[PDB]
Structures are given as structure tokens and as C-alpha cells.
Amino acid sequence: LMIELSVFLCLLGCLVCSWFLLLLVIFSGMLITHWIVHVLKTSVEVFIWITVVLATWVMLINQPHQTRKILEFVTWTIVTVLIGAFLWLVKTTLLKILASSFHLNRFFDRIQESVFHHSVLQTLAGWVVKVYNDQAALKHALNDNKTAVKQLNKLVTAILIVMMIVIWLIVTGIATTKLIVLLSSQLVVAAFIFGNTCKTIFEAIIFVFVMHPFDVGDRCVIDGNKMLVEEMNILTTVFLKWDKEKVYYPNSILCTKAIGNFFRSPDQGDVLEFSVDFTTPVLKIGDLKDRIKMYLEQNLNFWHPQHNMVVKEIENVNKIKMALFVNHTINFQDFAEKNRRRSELVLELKKIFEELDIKYNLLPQEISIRN
Ligand SMILES: CCCCCCCCCCCCCCCC(=O)O
């Protein structure tokens, strides 16, 4: 309740009106004055507030063996807190920077449409539901590629808190040296035993944030398996297979694989292999090449004009193996579209063989009947 905060402010004012105790009350009150001064923001406000409190306390302030020591305790506790706030602020800034690397521009058009719609809803308002439902869909689409960062933040924070506890224990002088030595000794033993798990976690972090072979929604190829990335985390990546089975891969194994990424690929190519009889006249082979050229040229929304036909080999004297190399106008992120276009090309090849009378026969077999 703002009223309670205001009451506390009033109480502090009363303490001053009725001076170190009042100054202390002003700090104890956790006054919103810093927020007003500030009207990353809240990490900055805390940092400033702590800094002011420390400076005030030191300026505000016989029994060196008995009570003076409490002043040392307080001095250093406040300092530890300020160190903590500082590191906290640094952490936040760096993680925000990291997160920006996960912004995807694939949503640029959706973002611009949403900005326009929300701008007009501020003045022409009095369709609207679609705008808000699309806004929600976009916010989730963008937040889905930042889940690894949120996880890293939790991990880093836990480490940071522990580091600050240790700093407090040391800087205030509360810890003694025999316990510090036993503490460090046990930590080394723990590292010895569980260090290998930490190595794995760290390597997974490098894979996800530095190597970064894929993002969410990309269609990737791993060990010949074409899979869509559903989500990314620090320890695991979740993929959908072509039949939509959900598959969980340890990042520790993906870190050692060659990963294809269709989303990021340039227009991809393809191959149609076939065979014809050895006796097919070279003239029909020439006609086949011309017919194919015309087909591809009549369908430039699907095919680039560059293609090659390669004659590979003569098997016995019966078969000629050939292959047609073509180039699609798309990459293979939309796999179904790729197959539909290829399917039409295969049927065109069928048609050409029929029209040009291209066949394949089996070698003849000689029979001798004994009776
Ligand atoms: C804080 C240390 C925990 C030990 C595991 C190291 C990774 C930090 C925890 C982040 C979650 C990793 C991904 C698991 C899947 C999920 O979160 O749903």
C-alpha cells in the first residue's frame, strides 16, 4: 500500500521533527525518493540507494575491544551489500546484451504490422480483438527463442549469491582462517568429483550461445534426420521429427555433430536419377535434354534455368545410367513444398520418355532345350 509507505515516510519525518537516529530512519524506511530521482532501472536505483546509505552511515559514525567492533561489522556488511549490487547490475547488463543476439528478424514484418495496429488503436478506437490476439502470438514467438538466456540467468545468479556470501564472511572478518581453510579444502574435493558434470554444463553453454548452429523453428538435419527445432535449453534441445515425434537430445551429444540448417541455407538443389537402354540413339538423348530445358524455362517460379544432365556409366551393354541436376528457387525449410515441386518434375520426365519413345529392355536369354 502506497499509503503505508507514505505513513512510514511520515513516521521518519516525525522522528526528525521530535539527528543520526532520524538519518538512520530515512534509510531504514527504504524511501521511494530514489525512485522519484529516477522518475536496468531498478538495479540502478538499488545501487544508488545503497551507495547513499553507506556514505551517510560512514559520515554519521572509545570501546575498541567491545563495541567498536560492531561498527566494523556494520561498515563491512554495508560494503558487501554494495559490492553485491554492483555485480548484480553488471550481470544484468551483460545478459541483456546476450539476449539481443537471439532476436530474430524473421518476425520483422509481423512486428511492423503490430506497431501500426497498436498505434491506430490509441486514437481511432471507440478487428480489435485480432490485433490483440496477434500481439500475444508475436510476444510468445519472440520469447520462445530466449528461454536459454533465462536459464543461464538463474544459474549465474545462484553462483553470484554464493560468491557474495563468501565475500561477506571474509570482508567483515567474521570468518576465521581455520574454517576458511577447511572450506576451501572441501571445495577442491567436490570439484575433483563433480567437475566433469560442470564441464558438460559449460560446454553446452558454449554450444548454445557461441557456436549457435540453429534457432527455434529452424529445420535442421542431424545424422540424416530432418527435424524442426521446437525449443532450446541449456542442457537439451527438443526437436520434432517429420512425423512430429518429440525428441530430446542432450546438448552434450549435439556438440559433437555436424548439423545441417535449411533455414539458413541458400536456394537448394536436387537430383533425379534414371536409366535408359544402351541402344537409345544419341539423338534421343539430345532430345531429352532439350525437352527438359524447355520445361524448366516454362516454370521459373520453381526452377532456376541452370541444370545439368550427366551420363555416368555403361553397364554391360544394356544400361546407361544418367542423372539430372536441378536448382530450386527455395531452400528446404518448407519441405512439403519442395516435394510437390520435385514430384511435378518427375512426372514431366515420365511424359518426355513416353513422347520420345525412350525405353529400357532386359538382356535377352538364350535357351537350349534338352527335351
Ligand atoms: C542451477 C544448477 C542446476 C544444474 C543443471 C545446470 C543447468 C541450469 C538449470 C537450467 C535448466 C536446464 C534445462 C532443463 C530443461 C528445462 O528447464 O525445462
Residue numbers in the entry: 186 to 203, 222 to 242, 264 to 285, 290 to 354, 507 to 751
Text from the published report:
FLYC1 is an ortholog of prokaryotic MS ion channel MscS (mechanosensitive ion channel of small conductance), which functions as an osmotic release valve, and is perhaps the most extensively studied MS channel. FLYC1 comprises a homoheptamer with six TMs (TM1–TM6) per protomer and intracellular N and C termini.
The two classes are referred to as either ‘up’ or ‘down’ based on the orientation of two cytoplasmic helices that extend from the transmembrane domain (TMD). The molecular model of FLYC1 was initially built from the best-resolved of the two classes, the up class, which was the primary subject of our structural analysis unless otherwise stated. In the up conformation, the TM4-TM5 linker is parallel to the membrane plane, while in the down conformation, the linker swivels towards the cytosol. In the up state, the cytosolic extension of TM4 interacts with the β-domain of the cytoplasmic cage through a salt bridge between R334 and D598 (2.9 Å distance). To test this, we disrupted the R334–D598 salt bridge by either mutating the arginine to glutamate or mutating the aspartate to lysine and determined its effect on channel kinetics. D598K mutation rendered the channel non-functional, but remarkably, stretch-activated currents from R334E mutant exhibited a drastic increase in open-dwell time in both macroscopic and single-channel currents. Effectively, the deactivation time constant of the channel was approximately 40-fold slower than WT (WT: 0.477 ± 0.285 s (N = 6); R334E: 18.5 ± 5.2 s (N = 6)).
